[PDB]
């Protein structure tokens, strides 16, 4: 009945973004007030020595949308972009986390991809993680937003910074045009895809990589889960082992990541987190990116898988590997113990 | 998104103010002479001179009534507000 | 979707892209002119060195009530009284002219009266001018306003500064209860009044001032005119000469002024202006007061009599005896050349 | 002051808040209008702005065809918004 309301109803198109995930660790704050949060954050920033505690407490306990509202209110109050203010006020890994949290999921993924390809030294691990784990919708929005942010198609940058079948696979996946989940189980096609995967790889000298690429990028995820299960009937090694035997380097890394994402994405992210912390120091880039990007998607399942496999909680490992306000932020994004 | 933006609230006020007075006498969706004068005198006293010629008010009413039905609907009320704002902008621009 | 609806509305509106037809009426009803005048005056004031030219051009070319409108708008916009601002910004005679113009006729007359009675001394010339020249209506409004501007009645302050039959005359006149014009001539009362006025002064060894005051304050103006013309049949001297021979001083001056007004008020003001500019320098007080007080009363008649008697226009003498924006203001009040 | 007066004042000042950033200080170019909408009516264009539709809007708001939006055209725009919202009374 108000102008804001009218314009909102009219603006909502037909698509309401998408329904929220019940498996995210970060939920929408119930008693949300964007102005109060913007004000408190401003006062925390302008406090001598900077009050990181308050900034973390607020931002890690608001949904991404709510963070956008906070950013808007903050710009309206101070005539300064919140991301810039926090960039100048913060440092180290905490800065990376907060700045990551301030971006929309598409903006965040786009800038992580760009960063992975920026400079002659390409970061294949990050590129692979993002391109192999994102769904059709997520990738459509990523292609769009990447194009808006950097004035270049994501695909062209991928092509510029990759080569061979690794390039072909990355480009194929990035298109985000995987077949959607059908209502019928295509048993015949499951069997035929299993046979084709076997024939293209372990059964022959060398590898028919384009066959693998076609099957593993075009078929729906449930179909491919069944295909990988049927594949074990034909091959003495499962899909992952077969990949390890057939290919190497970037291509192998990409296929392993992809098959993991298809079989069990939460487990995939749990293993990546473990890898980021298990050894000397921390792979902070990966840790942070995963804690930020999965915080409202499947962090609860990631935590479940992690605790099940490694025996201690994700919370525990973060707690042992990081310190200070940075640690506190990551633990907030974790959601809790176990 | 609570706390509507200034311009949104301004539009809200503009819309509600019309029905605040049009919903008193006669047509519930139109303003007559009396209702319009109430709206002017009460909601915009800062725009009224020290004195008010009734003939100038009649000419105003006649000019706002574009379709000639002895009343001012929301559209003509909008062109009125537009005129007021344009006066304000005249005072803003040069000075 | 909002854009769609907006476009439909725009098509409904059309591209009428000239100042809308109702704009004129809106400006008229809201008194746009007074607001513009006010803003221009404020700009002229705040201008370094003060732009007196614009102040004069505007204020001396507006009617008194229009000046009241401009003062109202100025006070509403600046949150400062126009009279005070112009008081600070102006000086010399131009200040007294502009400040004089800002008052209503009754307020101006009252302030001039209090000014004439201010101090240990008294400007009985100004007092005589106002009291003898103003009509009954004007005098009643002057009383009512004087009683509000200051704590006391006009008559009270009058009888506190004058004395004797001069006081009696000034009070009688200031009463403003003169008999109004009559449809009947009443020739008998005319002859009796004239002959009484003769028997009260010239024929007598002394002079009967009370009878003089009574007759010349109670009777109506036309009746008194015919009485004064009938007086020329009984006395070898006209009324003015008789006054000049029967009484001296302030009473003489008062009687002369009164008879002059009664016989021909515009000619009275014309002669008074001529005297104000006649000799060395200028009687600026008188000139200013007359030009201000009569600009919207009988200025055309004053100019007519002035031109008729002195050969050249009031405009000419004003131009010759005054210079600068002061001169411009006076000439503006004059209304043009003759 | 009175609510409608403050509303009008917001209307007037908001225009000049964005009109004076680039080029003609008394007219809104495309980017200036876009910014005004983005900051003052965020739900108008929505999360993702249809550039084609926005160009149509800019084009139709530009009655005198000088590729920019002056104050009168801006008044027509706001009037259209107010009428649209009024229709859902
Ligand atoms: Ca600190
Ligand atoms: Ca920093
Ligand atoms: Ca590169
Ligand atoms: Ca092989
Ligand atoms: Ca470690
Ligand atoms: Ca009505
Ligand atoms: Ca009408
Ligand atoms: Ca000067
Ligand atoms: Ca002074
Ligand atoms: Ca005295
Ligand atoms: Ca005698
Ligand atoms: Ca002289
Ligand atoms: Ca501009
Ligand atoms: Ca235009």
Query: Which domains are delineated in chain A?
Result: 31-103 (1.10.220.10), 104-177 (1.10.220.10), 178-264 (1.10.220.10), 265-338 (1.10.220.10)
Q: Given an 8 Å threshold on Cβ–Cβ distance, is A34 in contact with B2? A: yes
**Within 13 Å, how many C-alpha atoms sit on residue A132's CB side?**
30
C-beta of residue C239 within 8 angstroms of C-beta of residue C259: yes
∠ at Cα C41 (C26, C70), nearest 5°? 50
Q: Say which of C6, C7, C17 has its CB closest to residue D81.
A: C6
Measured from the alpha carbon of residue C320, the closest ligand is 12
**Token pair in block for residue C79:** 């949150």
Burial A220-258 (b: 16+ CB within 10 A, else e): bbebbebbbebbeeebebebeebbeebbeebbebbbbbb
**Cα–Cα dist A144/A160, whole Å:** 19
Does the beta carbon of B87 lie under 8 angstroms from any beta carbon of chain D? Answer: no
In chain A, residues with a C-beta closer than 8 Å to the C-beta of C1 are 10-11, 13
Which conformational region is residue A324 in: left (phi greater than 0), alpha (psi within -120 to 50 degrees), or beta?
left
Q: Given an 8 Å threshold on Cβ–Cβ distance, is C2 in contact with A11? A: yes
Q: Comparing C-alpha atoms, which of D79, A118, C117, D25 is closest to residue B78?
A: D79
A181 secondary structure, DSSP code? P
Contacts of B27 (CB under 8 A, 6+ apart): B71
Which conformational region is residue B26 in: left (phi greater than 0), alpha (psi within -120 to 50 degrees), or beta?
left
Give the closest-approach CA distance of B54 to chain A in angstroms. Answer: 35
Q: Given an 8 Å threshold on Cβ–Cβ distance, is B8 in contact with A4? A: yes
Positive or negative: CA dihedral A29, A34, A37, A41 = positive
**Cα–Cα dist A203/A197, whole Å:** 9
C105-117 vs C136-149: helix axis angle to the nearest 10?
Answer: 70
**Taking the C-alpha atoms of C153, C159, C160 and C165 in order, what is their torsion angle to the nearest 10 degrees?**
170
Contacts of B49 (CB under 8 A, 6+ apart): C30, C31, C34, C69, C72, C73
Does the beta carbon of B87 lie under 8 angstroms from any beta carbon of chain C? Answer: yes
Q: Please list the residues that pair with D28 across neighbouring strands.
A: D69
**Cα–Cα dist A294/A99, whole Å:** 15
Is there a binding annotation on residue D27? yes
CA distances from A23 to A20, A298, A307, C319 (A): 9, 5, 16, 94
- Subunits with 3+ Cβ pairs within 8 Å of B are A, C, D
Contacts of C198 (CB under 8 A, 6+ apart): C231, C234, C235
Contacts of D3 (CB under 8 A, 6+ apart): B13, B17, B43
∠ at Cα C222 (C221, C227), nearest 5°? 95
**Cα–Cα dist A67/A58, whole Å:** 9
**Cα–Cα dist D30/D39, whole Å:** 14
**Token pair in block for residue B19:** 């029905």
Closest residue, chain B, to A70 (C-alpha): B1
How crowded is residue C181: how many other Cβ atoms within 10 Å of its Cβ? 9
**Cα–Cα dist A210/A218, whole Å:** 12
How crowded is residue C39: how many other Cβ atoms within 10 Å of its Cβ? 18
Q: Comparing C-alpha atoms, which of A273, A219, A214, A262 is closest to residue A239?
A: A262
Phi, psi (degrees; rounded to nearest 5) at C81: -70, 130
CA distances from B56 to A160, B52, C25, C26, C270 (A): 73, 8, 7, 9, 39
**Cα–Cα dist C222/C238, whole Å:** 17
Phi, psi (degrees; rounded to nearest 5) at B31: -105, 130
C-beta of residue A36 within 8 angstroms of C-beta of residue A308: no
**Cα–Cα dist A66/A32, whole Å:** 8
**Cα–Cα dist D52/D56, whole Å:** 6
C46 CA to centre of ligand 9 in angstroms: 14
**Token pair in block for residue C47:** 């201008």
**Taking the C-alpha atoms of A141, A142, A146 and A149 in order, what is their torsion angle to the nearest 10 degrees?**
60
Contacts of D53 (CB under 8 A, 6+ apart): C3, C4
Tally of residues, chain C = 338
Beta strands in chain D (DSSP E): none
CA distances from A290 to A105, A230, A284, A287 (A): 12, 31, 10, 5
**Cα–Cα dist B1/A66, whole Å:** 9
- DSSP labels, A116-180: HHSSSS--HHHHHHHHHH--HHHHHHHHHHHHHHHSS-HHHHHHHH--HHHHHHHHHHHT--PPP
C-beta of residue B13 within 8 angstroms of C-beta of residue B7: no
In chain C, residues with a C-beta closer than 8 Å to the C-beta of B47 are 30
Q: Please list the residues that pair with D69 across neighbouring strands.
A: D28
Question: Residue with structure tokens 């800002």?
Answer: C102
Task: Give pairs for C156-161: CB < 8 Å, separation 24+.
Answer: C157/C113, C157/C114, C157/C117, C158/C117, C161/C117, C161/C122
Q: Which CATH superfamily is domain D1-89 in?
A: EF-hand (1.10.238.10)
Residue D49's SS3 state is coil
In chain C, residues with a C-beta closer than 8 Å to the C-beta of A15 are none
Q: Given an 8 Å threshold on Cβ–Cβ distance, is A3 in contact with B1? A: no
Q: Comparing C-alpha atoms, which of D44, D45, D21 is closest to residue D31?
A: D21
**Token pair in block for residue D76:** 């027509």
**Cα–Cα dist A185/A229, whole Å:** 14
- DSSP labels, A61-105: TS-HHHHHHHHHHHHHHHSS-HHHHHHHH--HHHHHHHHHHHS-H
Phi, psi (degrees; rounded to nearest 5) at D19: -75, -20
**Cα–Cα dist C231/C263, whole Å:** 13
Positive or negative: CA dihedral A64, A68, A69, A75 = positive
Q: Is D58 exposed, middle or buried (0-12, 13-18, 19+ CB in 10 A)?
A: middle
Q: Comparing C-alpha atoms, which of A81, A72, A65 is closest to residue A29?
A: A65
What residue ranges do the domains of chain D occupy? Answer: 1-89
B45 secondary structure, DSSP code? G
CA distances from A172 to A136, A155, A215 (A): 12, 9, 11
What does this entry list as its resolution, in Å?
Answer: 2.1
Question: Residue with structure tokens 């221009």?
Answer: C40
C-beta of residue A300 within 8 angstroms of C-beta of residue A25: yes
Give the closest-approach CA distance of C30 to chain B in angstroms. Answer: 5
Q: How was this structure determined?
A: X-ray
Find which of D8, D20, D35, D87 to mutate to test the B interface (most B CBs within 10 Å of its CB).
D8
Give the closest-approach CA distance of C53 to chain B in angstroms. Answer: 17
CA A206 to mean position of chain CA atoms: 33
Contacts of C120 (CB under 8 A, 6+ apart): none
> From the annotation, which residues of B make up the binding site for Ca(2+)?
30, 35, 65, 67, 69, 71, 76
Which conformational region is residue A121 in: left (phi greater than 0), alpha (psi within -120 to 50 degrees), or beta?
beta
**Cα–Cα dist A114/B42, whole Å:** 59
SS (H, E, C) chain C: CHHHHHHHHHHHHCCCCCCCCCHHHHHHHCCHHHHHHHHHHHHHHHCCCCCHHHHHHHHCCCCHHHHHHHHHHHHHHHCCCHHHHHHHHCCHHHHHHHHHHHCCHHHHHHHHHHHHHCCCCCCHHHHHHHHHHCCHHHHHHHHHHHHHHCCCCHHHHHCCCCCHHHHHHHHHHHCCCCCCCCCCCCHHHHHHHHHHHHHHCCCCCCCCHHHHHHHHHHCCHHHHHHHHHHHHHHCCCCHHHHHHHHCCHHHHHHHHHHHHHHHHHHHHHHHHHHHHHHCCCCCHHHHHHHHHHHCCCCHHHHHHHHHHHHCCCHHHHHHHHCCHHHHHHHHHHHCCCC
**Cα–Cα dist A46/A85, whole Å:** 10
**Cα–Cα dist A100/D11, whole Å:** 37
Closest residue, chain B, to C31 (C-alpha): B49
C116 CA to centre of ligand 10 in angstroms: 7
Q: Given an 8 Å threshold on Cβ–Cβ distance, is D84 in contact with C10? A: no
C-beta of residue C133 within 8 angstroms of C-beta of residue C268: yes
Q: B1-95: which CATH number, 3.30.420.240, 1.10.238.10, 3.40.718.10, 1.10.3720.10?
A: 1.10.238.10
Q: Comparing C-alpha atoms, which of C109, C122, C95 is closest to residue C150?
A: C109
**Token pair in block for residue A224:** 């491919």
Residue B31's SS3 state is strand
C-beta of residue C190 within 8 angstroms of C-beta of residue C226: yes
Q: Given an 8 Å threshold on Cβ–Cβ distance, is C2 in contact with D77? A: no
CB pairs A-B closer than 8 Å: 23
Question: Residue with structure tokens 């974790």?
Answer: A334
Question: Residue with structure tokens 């008074």?
Answer: C272
């Amino acid at each position: 009945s108000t102008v804001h309301e009218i314009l909102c109803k009219l603006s909502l198109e037909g698509d309401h973004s998408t329904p929220p995930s019940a498996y995210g660790s970060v939920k929408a704050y119930t008693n949300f007030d964007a102005e109060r949060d913007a004000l408190n954050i401003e006062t925390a920033i302008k406090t001598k020595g900077v009050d990181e505690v308050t900034i973390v407490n607020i931002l890690t306990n608001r949904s991404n949308e709510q963070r956008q509202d906070i950013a808007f209110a903050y710009q309206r109050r101070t005539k300064k972009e919140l991301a810039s203010a926090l960039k100048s006020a913060l440092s180290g890994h905490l800065e990376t986390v907060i700045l990551g949290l301030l971006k929309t999921p598409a903006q965040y993924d786009a800038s992580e991809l760009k960063a992975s390809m920026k400079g002659l030294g390409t970061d294949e691990d990050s590129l692979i993680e993002i391109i192999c784990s994102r769904t059709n919708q997520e990738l459509q929005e990523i292609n769009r937003v990447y194009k808006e942010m950097y004035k270049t198609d994501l695909e062209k940058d991928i092509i510029s910074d990759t080569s061979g079948d690794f390039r072909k696979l990355m480009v194929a996946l990035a298109k985000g045009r995987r077949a959607e989940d059908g209502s019928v189980i295509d048993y015949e096609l499951i069997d035929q895809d299993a046979r084709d995967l076997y024939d293209a790889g372990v059964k022959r000298k060398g590898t028919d990589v384009p066959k693998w690429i076609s099957i593993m990028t075009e078929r729906s995820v449930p179909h491919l889960q069944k295909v990988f299960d049927r594949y074990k009937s034909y091959s003495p090694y499962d899909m992952l082992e077969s990949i390890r035997k057939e290919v190497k380097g970037d291509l192998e890394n990409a296929f392993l990541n992809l098959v993991q994402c298809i079989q069990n994405k939460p487990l995939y992210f749990a293993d990546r987190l473990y890898d980021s912390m298990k050894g000397k120091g921390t792979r902070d880039k990966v840790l942070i990116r995963i804690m930020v990007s999965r915080s409202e998607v499947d962090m609860l399942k990631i935590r479940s898988e992690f605790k099940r496999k490694y025996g201690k909680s994700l919370y525990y490992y973060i707690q042992q590997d990081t310190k200070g306000d940075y640690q506190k932020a990551l633990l907030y994004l974790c959601g809790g113990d176990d | 998104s609570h706390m509507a933006c200034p311009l949104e609230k301004a539009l809200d006020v503009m819309v509600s103010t019309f029905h605040k007075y049009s919903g008193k006498e006669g047509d519930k969706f139109k303003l007559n002479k009396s209702e319009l004068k109430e709206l002017l005198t009460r909601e915009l006293p800062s725009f009224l001179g020290k004195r008010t010629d009734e003939a100038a008010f009649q000419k105003l009413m006649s000019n706002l009534d574009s379709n000639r039905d002895n009343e001012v609907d929301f559209q003509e009320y909008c062109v009125f507000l537009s005129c007021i704002a344009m006066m304000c902008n005249e005072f803003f621009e040069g000075f």
